[PDB]
């Protein structure tokens, strides 16, 4: 019984989180009312990882919904599976965070954070043996970014030896709500460097390009982007939700060779547009899964080197043909794998495929190419910070310029650390 506690914070965090629970609830045969109606015992084998079992054979997600305004969580509660969440696990204020990291981290967020921890503690107290936590949030806003990283810091203080995992949506000027997003993202990245064990970097620019160029969606919406995130989140948690190998700590031990370099690039295959009924062969799955266009960090893997790679294959397929294709990708592009971590490419197979697909593959890379993402953010941060532009939103909440300069240096240090292992 290796329980995980899920937290979703802010607008982006709650909208992606709601879709994640809709996707995996379907995979486990859980209906919107929490009642199981599947047909495979594999659906319940590891059900307690994400669901608590209530009276009457009801399964309730171990999820905590957090926000500084009520709007998005009202939508979730009225959404498809909104009724499946524990009513007491909705924790929200009324002020909002105004896309302001300081409001989420130091003022508005500080007034609400204790009540969130009360719910976290309640959920953790009913775990037979808690693995750790997973947080979904964006870095470009105020609640998910500022209050989300505040929550991570207070969870680490109370649960110092539990794994902390995040799905962190990185802002992009191509899919932007406000100009201060690089400020909020730079402030958050330092928190993540210090206080998470594993962070999945999901870049809104990569999600957009996939929807527009590959999926051929003329006008992509946040909903279209979240469909990709839902599918990716289901893929990277398959090995936790079904029989295999295994737990968050073991994953971290084999993915993270250096403590600060724990930012992963995820990928998914297939990504097909509506020729959607065609059967996808193992070679096609393997070639696409390693293609940059299938990755969601907007970083060119051929610009850096893979420290470690995990690949999960779902569906009834030839595990013999999987190994042959995987061993083919490595032994055909070994110039992009560091040669000082032997056998750093691991493959796992799961028999249950995602809804609507005969088979699929999910890709998790710890690549030094992720420095390109942090470089983009750093350059956008400095273009404004050089002129102290928009800083008054943050100094009005009590922040000083020195904290911005420290965040600037912290992320440039991180970029420098990736660059040394790329050579």
């Amino acid at each position: 019984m290796r329980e995980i506690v899920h937290i979703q914070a802010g607008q982006c965090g709650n909208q992606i989180g709601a879709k994640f629970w809709e996707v995996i609830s379907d995979e486990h045969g859980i209906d919107p009312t929490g009642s199981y109606h599947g047909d495979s015992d594999l659906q319940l084998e590891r059900i307690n990882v994400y669901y608590n079992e209530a009276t009457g054979n009801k399964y309730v997600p171990r999820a905590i919904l957090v926000d500084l305004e009520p709007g998005t969580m009202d939508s979730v509660r009225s959404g498809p599976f909104g009724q499946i969440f524990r009513p007491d696990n909705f924790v929200f204020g009324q002020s909002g965070a105004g896309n302001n990291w300081a409001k989420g981290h130091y003022t508005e967020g500080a007034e609400l954070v204790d009540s969130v921890l009360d719910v976290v503690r309640k959920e953790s107290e009913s775990c037979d043996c808690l693995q750790g936590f997973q947080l979904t949030h964006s870095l470009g806003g105020g609640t998910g970014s500022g209050m989300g990283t505040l929550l991570i810091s207070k969870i680490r203080e109370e649960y110092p030896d539990r794994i902390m995992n995040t799905f962190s949506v990185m802002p992009s000027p191509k899919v932007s709500d406000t100009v201060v997003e690089p400020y909020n993202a730079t402030l958050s990245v330092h928190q993540l460097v210090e206080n998470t064990d594993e962070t999945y970097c999901i870049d809104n620019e990569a999600l957009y390009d996939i929807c527009f160029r590959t999926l051929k969606l003329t006008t992509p919406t946040y909903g279209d982007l979240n469909h990709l995130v839902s599918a990716t989140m289901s893929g990277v948690t398959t090995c936790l939700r079904f029989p295999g190998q295994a737990d968050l700590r073991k994953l971290a031990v084999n993915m993270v060779p250096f403590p600060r370099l724990h930012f992963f690039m995820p990928g998914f295959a297939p990504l097909t547009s509506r020729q959607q009924y065609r059967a996808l062969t193992v070679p096609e799955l393997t070639q696409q899964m390693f293609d940059s266009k299938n990755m969601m960090a907007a970083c060119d893997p051929r610009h850096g080197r893979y420290l470690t790679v995990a690949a999960i294959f779902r569906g009834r397929m030839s595990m013999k043909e999987v190994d042959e294709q995987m061993l083919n990708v490595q032994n055909k592009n070994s110039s992009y794998f560091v040669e000082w971590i032997p056998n750093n490419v691991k493959t796992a197979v799961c028999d249950i495929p995602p809804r609507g697909l005969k088979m699929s593959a999910t890709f998790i890379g710890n690549s030094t190419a992720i420095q390109e993402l942090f470089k983009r953010i750093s350059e956008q941060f400095t273009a404004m910070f050089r002129r102290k532009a928009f800083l008054h939103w943050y100094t009005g909440e009590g922040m000083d310029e020195m904290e911005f300069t420290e965040a600037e240096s912290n992320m440039n240090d991180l970029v420098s650390e990736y660059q040394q292992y790329q050579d």
């Binding site: 002020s95 006008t219 009005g396």
Partner: protein, 440 residues
């Protein structure tokens, strides 16, 4: 929650308030007696329109507003007009003797006798709010009450409500409808005094509105009524994000984040389209592309200036009506290729978009055609400082001879207040130059 309190100061503020609240009632289906048949929650609620209207147990929907003037004749027309039942009598506050176009009388001699009662009435409105967001203050630059009393009130609101947000709709003087030679004095005085107390101010150049009415509506000699009907449409476009809910709706406060890069640089340039008569609109459906392109026609700006001669620090598009993102994106792509919109080098260049699906409305007997879709662009351009420069030049001509200054000194002011205010304006003009220079 998120309530907004409107304050209408002086003749221009009150009469523009009349037009705005009449338009709001039409957009929301509120009758002149305050009843709203479509509102099924009696005496309360948290609907989007509740940001601007409270509710009584008898089903009356009451504007969250105070009207204030130092003489009674303008507010008296509200007390006896079509929407007299809309307001509680205590929301309409009048003195006997006005400021006589003298900032000093509005801020000091006369204003000081009524400021406490005004604040007490505003407090009564605030007490009914569960999450007051801030104030919207409507006033002229040129009148004695609009300038002097507004600045006194803004100072007192900072003390009584702290940093709670205060936005202005400020009427910038034009010679075609101006009533005082000293309006440049009053404008500089109130702009200086109010600057540190305002989070965001939308200037409305009366000469720009006058030209638009003559040019686009074929009105030979526009009256205050003509001007205020158009101004109310622009005000409505800006506040629609607060009064209506929608999937594509973006809150005014989120636009504000992008629009104000430094506390003093808080004067957005508004542009509105389409402004067209019924005779011209007939059988002529104006598309998203057409009204968007019009946003970048200088003739459609609320303040006369040349953005082509400055730099952009933000561009926001507030659509309402039958508009979908696909058509917006296509319209923007066209503009990004035919107009060189130059941004400062320290600012992102992406346009920020919001859409409110509720279609625009018009008041019967008006000049504007009824349209299926409209847009208000809010830009932060260094070019708006041209409006300060024109005002400062008229100030300088008169002040060099101290013309009319004795009227202000006689009411207790000192010449030091004029030079202090004028120096702040010079620094503000210099600030607008500085932010436009490229980084080193």
């Amino acid at each position: 929650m998120r309530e907004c309190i409107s304050i209408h100061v002086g003749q221009a503020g009150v009469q523009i308030g009349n037009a705005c609240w009449e338009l709001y009632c039409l957009e929301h289906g509120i009758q002149p007696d305050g009843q709203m048949p479509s509102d099924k929650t009696i005496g309360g609620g948290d609907d989007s329109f509740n940001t601007f209207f409270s509710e009584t147990g008898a089903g009356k929907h009451v504007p969250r507003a105070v009207f204030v003037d130092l003489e009674p004749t303008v507010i008296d027309e509200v007390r006896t007009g079509t929407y007299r039942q809309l307001f509680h009598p205590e929301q309409l506050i009048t003195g006997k003797e006005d400021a006589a176009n003298n900032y000093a009388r509005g801020h000091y001699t006369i204003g000081k006798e009524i400021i406490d009662l005004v604040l007490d009435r505003i407090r009564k409105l605030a007490d009914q709010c569960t999450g007051l967001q801030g104030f919207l203050v409507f006033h002229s630059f040129g009148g004695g009450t609009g300038s002097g009393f507004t600045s006194l009130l803004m100072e007192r609101l900072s003390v009584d409500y702290g940093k709670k947000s205060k936005l202005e709709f400020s009427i910038y003087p034009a010679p075609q409808v101006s009533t005082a030679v000293v309006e440049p004095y009053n404008s500089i005085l109130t702009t200086h005094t109010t600057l540190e107390h305002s989070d965001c101010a939308f200037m409305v150049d009366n000469e720009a509105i006058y030209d638009i009415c003559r040019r686009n509506l074929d009105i030979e000699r526009p009256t205050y009524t003509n001007l205020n009907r158009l101004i109310s449409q622009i005000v409505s476009s800006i506040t629609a994000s607060l009064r209506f809910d929608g999937a594509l709706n973006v809150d005014l406060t989120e636009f504000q984040t992008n629009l104000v890069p430094y506390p003093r640089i808080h004067f957005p340039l508004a542009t509105y389209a389409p402004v067209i008569s019924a005779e011209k609109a007939y059988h002529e459906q104006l598309s998203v592309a057409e009204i968007t392109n019009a946003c970048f026609e200088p003739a459609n700006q609320m303040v006369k200036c040349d953005p082509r001669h400055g730099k952009y620090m933000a561009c926001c598009l507030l659509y309402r009506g039958d508009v979908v993102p696909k058509d917006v994106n296509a319209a923007i792509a066209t503009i990004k290729t035919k107009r060189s919109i130059q941004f400062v080098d320290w600012c992102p260049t992406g346009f920020k978009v919001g859409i409110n699906y509720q279609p625009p409305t018009v008041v019967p007997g008006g000049d504007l055609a009824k349209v299926q879709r409209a847009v208000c662009m809010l830009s932060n351009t260094t070019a708006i400082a041209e409006a300060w420069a024109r005002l400062d030049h008229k100030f300088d001509l008169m002040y060099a001879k101290r013309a009319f200054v004795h009227w202000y000194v006689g009411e207790g002011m000192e010449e030091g207040e004029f030079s202090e205010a004028r120096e702040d304006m010079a620094a503000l003009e210099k600030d607008y130059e500085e932010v436009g220079v490229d980084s080193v």
